[PDB]
Ligand binder design. Structure first.
Ligand SMILES: CN1CCN(c2cc3c(cc2F)c(=O)c(-c2noc(Cc4ccccc4)n2)cn3Cc2ccc(C(F)(F)F)cc2F)CC1
Length: 555
């Protein structure tokens, strides 16, 4: 079965697309290296993601599936009311083709609610007719060496709300129960590091590897998608939920027709849709299932998995370098049979720091006392490129804010992102202005002035005093700054001292940002005690589940 079939109709934009970087130069001067993907490259992506999938299952697969269902059976899940579902809808979510928008949904306008009721009722009465989806090219920023745009497939606003009602509770609670500690989205960055470091430490003689499935969404078969449903259905559910879940699966999740922005039929999908509520959960369960089975086929000893959607990292007991090399090829052959072939082949690693998963890795620094501290970091190229874009253009999603929150302990986030953006917020007098950012796919509204206590709550006080970073980490940053033409430490330190001073003179939370975020920039350090406001912060539903493509909004 083909993941996609196409009519020949083009994937079209719904607005003018910028692929070019037009204050921003002060951040990064090699602006010709920064580009954004557009629909013009859609054809290239279409070719990559269109192929025949072959799948052969074995006893290991079946044993693991049985084990997952058994745990899934302990879960009780609730229907969301229409109101609860509406409030989860982002204010700028794509409007319905049926005469109402996200604002109408959020306001609970009777037109929107009446339509949502009719969609739900239709779901219960009809469990066959494929549901329409829109296919678009994503507009994302990168640095050269060029990626063709990613494709986004999503149903109408009315359907998405119904998805929330039927499955939000399921995709928010089920994965963690089924996969336990292996479920990646339950962790803040600090917690993700702790689990990785400790898992590594716990092996007698550890070996680990990241596994990249080539175009994971396309590798997901209709069988895979029904297997996921069978897992959902193990939950203790209301008869209405079971019916809706079954209808959504047959009518939307397993596949359906693709319609472009102009309304033309572009083709038909028979794999994972990137823009539905179950994408993250489905991908995570499916990746976990196949990888767990593959471990057994490959006879990897004491396999420990960490899974985030299609992102997979494995840490096990080494059986020797040659033996490991051979075991990994077997693991890969098993994954391939399950319809999850690798992009670039996995390779054994024997240094935790060298394992990149979720585009990030663990590294070491030292706190004020000289004590060792592990933190999550990544190559800063993309974050910096997108930071430049967001400086030179108005964008609804502030990746820089999300990056500061997730990578606050890193040298590059502290040195560059905090300095550059707080300087801009000072000039524009928009310190008090709340901004939208994404965490694990979900959209959050956050006040930049709260960053100190947010960071203390997530990464601890040491985040404000990390030094003596690894040479490997610094070389990567330096190499990146060279590549992108970014000013060196001496320049950012000078800028940071200026911003820090200006922040202090405003007092209040502003001064707190100056004192904590920029203590690194001053030669005589302040004392930095626990921020009292860091305790009374509501940081519960931040790191519970993934929702990439799931159209979720919180707070
Ligand atoms: C061959 N290798 C070359 C470099 N290598 C290293 C250089 C380092 C550090 C560790 C290294 F191994 C380190 O640990 C700190 C530091 N610690 O504490 C703060 C304070 C601080 C905190 C937060 C933000 C900024 C400064 N800065 C500073 N530098 C100097 C440095 C060089 C290059 C870059 C950059 F990458 F930008 F080119 C940035 C740097 F800082 C050793 C030998």
């Amino acid at each position: 079965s083909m993941s996609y079939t196409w009519t020949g109709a083009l994937i079209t934009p719904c607005a003018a697309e910028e692929s070019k970087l037009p204050l921003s130069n002060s951040l990064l001067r090699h602006h010709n290296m920064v580009y954004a993907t557009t629909s013009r490259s859609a054809g290239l992506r279409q070719k990559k993601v269109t192929f025949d999938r072959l799948q052969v299952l074995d006893d290991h697969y079946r044993d693991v599936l049985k084990e997952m269902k058994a745990k899934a059976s302990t879960v009780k899940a609730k229907l969301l009311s229409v109101e609860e579902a509406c409030k989860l809808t982002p204010p700028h979510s794509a409007k319905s083709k049926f005469g109402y928008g996200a604002k109408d949904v959020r306001n609970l306008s009777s037109k929107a609610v009446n339509h949502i009721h009719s969609v739900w009722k239709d779901l219960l009465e009809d469990t066959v007719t494929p549901i329409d989806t829109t296919i678009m090219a994503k507009n994302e920023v990168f640095c050269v060496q060029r990626k063709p745009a990613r494709l986004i497939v999503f149903p109408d606003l009315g359907v998405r709300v119904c998805e929330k009602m039927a499955l939000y509770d399921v995709v928010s609670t089920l994965p963690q129960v089924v996969m336990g500690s292996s479920y990646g989205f339950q962790y803040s960055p600090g917690q993700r590091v702790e689990f990785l470091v400790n898992t590594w430490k716990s092996k007698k003689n550890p070996m680990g590897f990241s596994y990249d499935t080539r175009c994971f969404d396309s590798t997901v078969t209709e069988n895979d998608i029904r297997v996921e449903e069978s897992i959902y259905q193990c939950c203790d559910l209301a008869p209405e939920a079971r019916q809706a879940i079954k209808s959504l699966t047959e009518r939307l999740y397993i596949g359906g027709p693709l319609t472009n922005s102009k309304g033309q039929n572009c083709g038909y999908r028979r794999c994972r849709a990137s823009g539905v509520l179950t994408t993250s959960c489905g991908n995570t369960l499916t990746c976990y299932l196949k990888a767990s089975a593959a471990c057994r086929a490959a006879k990897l000893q004491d396999c420990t998995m960490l899974v985030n959607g299609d992102d997979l990292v494995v840490i096990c007991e080494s059986a020797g370098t040659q033996e490991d090399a051979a075991s990994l090829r077997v693991f890969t052959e098993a994954m391939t049979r399950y319809s999850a072939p690798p992009g670039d082949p996995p390779q054994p690693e024997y240094d935790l720091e060298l394992i990149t998963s979720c585009s990030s890795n663990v590294s070491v620094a030292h706190d004020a006392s000289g004590k060792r501290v592990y933190y999550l970091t990544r190559d800063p190229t993309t974050p910096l490129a997108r930071a430049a874009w967001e400086t030179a253009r108005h964008t609804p999603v502030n990746s820089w804010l999300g990056n500061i929150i997730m990578y606050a302990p890193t040298l590059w986030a502290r040195m560059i992102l905090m300095t550059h953006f707080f300087s801009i917020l000072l000039a524009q007098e928009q310190l008090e202005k709340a901004l939208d950012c994404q965490i694990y796919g979900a959209c959050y509204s956050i006040e930049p002035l709260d960053l100190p206590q947010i960071i203390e709550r997530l990464h601890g006080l040491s985040a404000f005093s990390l030094h003596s970073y690894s040479p490997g980490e610094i070389n990567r940053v330096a190499s990146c700054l060279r590549k992108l033409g970014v000013p060196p430490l001496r320049v950012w330190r000078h800028r940071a001292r200026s911003v820090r001073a200006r922040l202090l003179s405003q007092g209040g939370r502003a001064a707190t940002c100056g004192k904590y975020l920029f203590n690194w920039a001053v030669k005589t350090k302040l004392k930095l005690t626990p921020i009292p406001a860091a305790s009374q912060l509501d940081l519960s539903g931040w790191f519970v589940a993934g929702y990439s493509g799931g159209d979720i909004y919180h707070s």
